[PDB]
Amino acid sequence: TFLRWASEPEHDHRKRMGLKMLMMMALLVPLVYTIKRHKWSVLKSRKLAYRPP
Amino acid sequence: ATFAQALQFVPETQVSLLDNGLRVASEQSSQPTCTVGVWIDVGSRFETEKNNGAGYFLEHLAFKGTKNRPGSALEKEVESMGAHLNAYSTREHTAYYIKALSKDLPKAVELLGDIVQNCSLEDSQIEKERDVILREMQENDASMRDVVFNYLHATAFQGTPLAQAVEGPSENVRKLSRADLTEYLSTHYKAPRMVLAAAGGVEHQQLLDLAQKHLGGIPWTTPCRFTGSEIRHRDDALPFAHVAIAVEGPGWASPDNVALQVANAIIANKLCQSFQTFSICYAETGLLGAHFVCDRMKIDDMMFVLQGQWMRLCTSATESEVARGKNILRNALVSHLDGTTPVCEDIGRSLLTYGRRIPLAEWESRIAEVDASVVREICSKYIYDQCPAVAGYGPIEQLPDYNRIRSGMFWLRF
C-alpha cells in the first residue's frame, strides 16, 4: 500500500476528479445531445416533394 | 385648416340596422357618382377542405345569372347604365360592388340584391366556370408574388382553415358540385353578416329604403395557430428569387396595429430589387413581415439587411425615424381614402372588422399616441426573438437555412 502511494501520490485526487468529471459528463452529454437534436430537427423532419410541370 | 382641424370636415358614415340584421352604411358627399356594394363576412378561412373553392366559384358565377334576369340581361343592364360591377374574395371577406352614377342608385342596389339573395346557378354556366377557373390556375401560375404569398400563408398557418388558398385546389374546384355551392350560399350569405355600404352622392335614407325594398328578404336567422415553418420551391430557371418572411401579427382588434404600421413605414432597396413591407391582418392573427425580389447571388445580403432593420427597430428606435413613420402612415391613410370606391371599401371592411367605421380623428389621435418607446416595445413584443414563417420561390439556394434565419431574429449584442 505504501509503495502504491509512493508510485501514485495523486491517487486520491485522481479518483476525486474522476468522480467529479463522471458526474459532469452525466450532466452534459445528454444536454449537448439534446441541443444537437434540437438544432438538427429542422433537417431531420423536413419533407421534400418533386413537382414537375 | 390644420391636418387635425381638416379631419373634422370628413362627413360621418351613418349606420342603420335592418330588421333581418343587414347593416346599411353610407357616407354622403357632394359627388356626382357613387359606388354601392355588399360586403359579406365569408372567406376561404370559413371553408372546409370539401368546399375550399366555393367562394371563388360563387364570385365567378355571381354575375353570370340570377332568377329574375339571365346573366346576359344582368350584364346588359349594368353596361347600359354606364356602371362597372366588380367583385373580390379574400380569405375573410367577400365583396360585390356596383360603381355607378348618383341618379342610378335605385337600380344598382336592386341589382346587388338580385345578385345576393337569388343567384341562378345554371349547370352549363357552372361547367363553363369550371373551365375558366382551370385556365385561371395556369394563368395565376405565372405570378410569382401571389404564389409566394400563398406559400407563406400555407406554411404559416398549416393545420388551420386560414392556410388554404382562396382559389382552392384544382381537384376541389373540379369536383365542386352545384349542391355544395347552394349549401355554401345558404350557410354563409345571410344577414346580419352583410353590410350594404355606399358613399359619394348617396343620401342615407335613400340607401336604407332601397336596402329594405331589395336586401330585406335575406333570411333573418378552430384555434388559429402560427407555426414558424418554411416552404422552399426552387425552379432554378426562374430569373429572380422571390422571398416573403413574416411573423404572427395581431388581429384586427388590437391597438398594436398602428405601431406596427409605423414600424413598417420606418423600414434600403439598393441591395435588393423591389423590397416591400406588409402587415396583413386577420380576425385573431396576422402576418407582419417583408417580401422582396432578389438576384440569384444576393438573397443572403437582403435578408441580413431586412433582419438588421428589424433588430434596430426592436432595440434602438430614435424619435426622428418614428416621427417620419407616423407622417408616412398619416399620408398613406388620407391618400388611400381618396376616391369613392376606396371609402366604400373602407366602410364595408371596417364594419365587417371593427363593427364600426373608425373616423380619421381617432386614427390620428392613435398615431399621435405612438412614440419611439412604444415602437421599440411593440416591435420587441412581436418581432424580436420570434420564430418566423418563410416562403421562397426560387431560384433559392443562397437563402439562409431556417436556423440561420431564426438566429438572425435576435442580437447577441443586445
Curated annotation (Swiss-Prot), chain A:
Recorded superkingdom: Eukaryota
UniProt topological domain (Mitochondrial matrix) ranges: 45-53
Function: Component of the ubiquinol-cytochrome c oxidoreductase, a multisubunit transmembrane complex that is part of the mitochondrial electron transport chain which drives oxidative phosphorylation.
Protein name as it appears in the record: Cytochrome c1, heme protein, mitochondrial
Assembly with partners or alone: Component of the ubiquinol-cytochrome c oxidoreductase (cytochrome b-c1 complex, complex III, CIII), a multisubunit enzyme composed of 11 subunits. The complex is composed of 3 respiratory subunits cytochrome b, cytochrome c1 and Rieske protein UQCRFS1, 2 core protein subunits UQCRC1/QCR1 and UQCRC2/QCR2, and 6 low-molecular weight protein subunits UQCRH/QCR6, UQCRB/QCR7, UQCRQ/QCR8, UQCR10/QCR9, UQCR11/QCR10 and subunit 9, the cleavage product of Rieske protein UQCRFS1.
Organism: Homo sapiens
Entry's family note: Belongs to the cytochrome c family.
Transmembrane segments: 11-44
Subcellular location: Mitochondrion inner membrane
Clinical condition linked: Mitochondrial complex III deficiency, nuclear type 6: An autosomal recessive disorder caused by mitochondrial dysfunction. It is characterized by onset in early childhood of episodic acute lactic acidosis, ketoacidosis, and insulin-responsive hyperglycemia, usually associated with infection. Laboratory studies show decreased activity of mitochondrial complex III. Psychomotor development is normal.
Swiss-Prot record, chain B:
PTM sites of type N6-succinyllysine: K128
MF annotations from Gene Ontology: metal ion binding; protein-containing complex binding; ubiquinol-cytochrome-c reductase activity; ubiquitin protein ligase binding
Entry keyword set: Acetylation, Disease variant, Electron transport, Membrane, Mitochondrion, Mitochondrion inner membrane, Neuropathy, Parkinsonism, Phosphoprotein, Respiratory chain, Transit peptide, Transport
Gene Ontology biological process terms in this record: aerobic respiration; cellular respiration; mitochondrial electron transport, ubiquinol to cytochrome c; oxidative phosphorylation; response to activity; response to alkaloid
Expressed in which tissues: Expressed in brain, including substantia nigra, striatum, cortex and cerebellum, and in spinal cord, heart, kidney, liver and muscle.
Membrane topology category: Peripheral membrane protein
Residues annotated with Phosphoserine modification: S177
One cellular component (GO) term of this entry: respiratory chain complex
One Pfam assignment: Peptidase_M16_C
Signal sequence range: none
Main location: mitochondrion
Family: Belongs to the peptidase M16 family. UQCRC1/QCR1 subfamily.
Subunit-structure text: Component of the ubiquinol-cytochrome c oxidoreductase (cytochrome b-c1 complex, complex III, CIII), a multisubunit enzyme composed of 11 subunits. The complex is composed of 3 respiratory subunits cytochrome b, cytochrome c1 and Rieske protein UQCRFS1, 2 core protein subunits UQCRC1/QCR1 and UQCRC2/QCR2, and 6 low-molecular weight protein subunits UQCRH/QCR6, UQCRB/QCR7, UQCRQ/QCR8, UQCR10/QCR9, UQCR11/QCR10 and subunit 9, the cleavage product of Rieske protein UQCRFS1.
Functional description taken from the UniProt entry: Component of the ubiquinol-cytochrome c oxidoreductase, a multisubunit transmembrane complex that is part of the mitochondrial electron transport chain which drives oxidative phosphorylation.
Disease implicated: Parkinsonism with polyneuropathy: An autosomal dominant disorder characterized by late-onset, levodopa-responsive parkinsonism with asymmetric tremor, rigidity and bradykinesia. Patients also manifest a sensorimotor polyneuropathy with variable degrees of distal legs and hands muscle atrophy and weakness, and absent deep tendon reflexes.
UniProt name for this protein: Cytochrome b-c1 complex subunit 1, mitochondrial
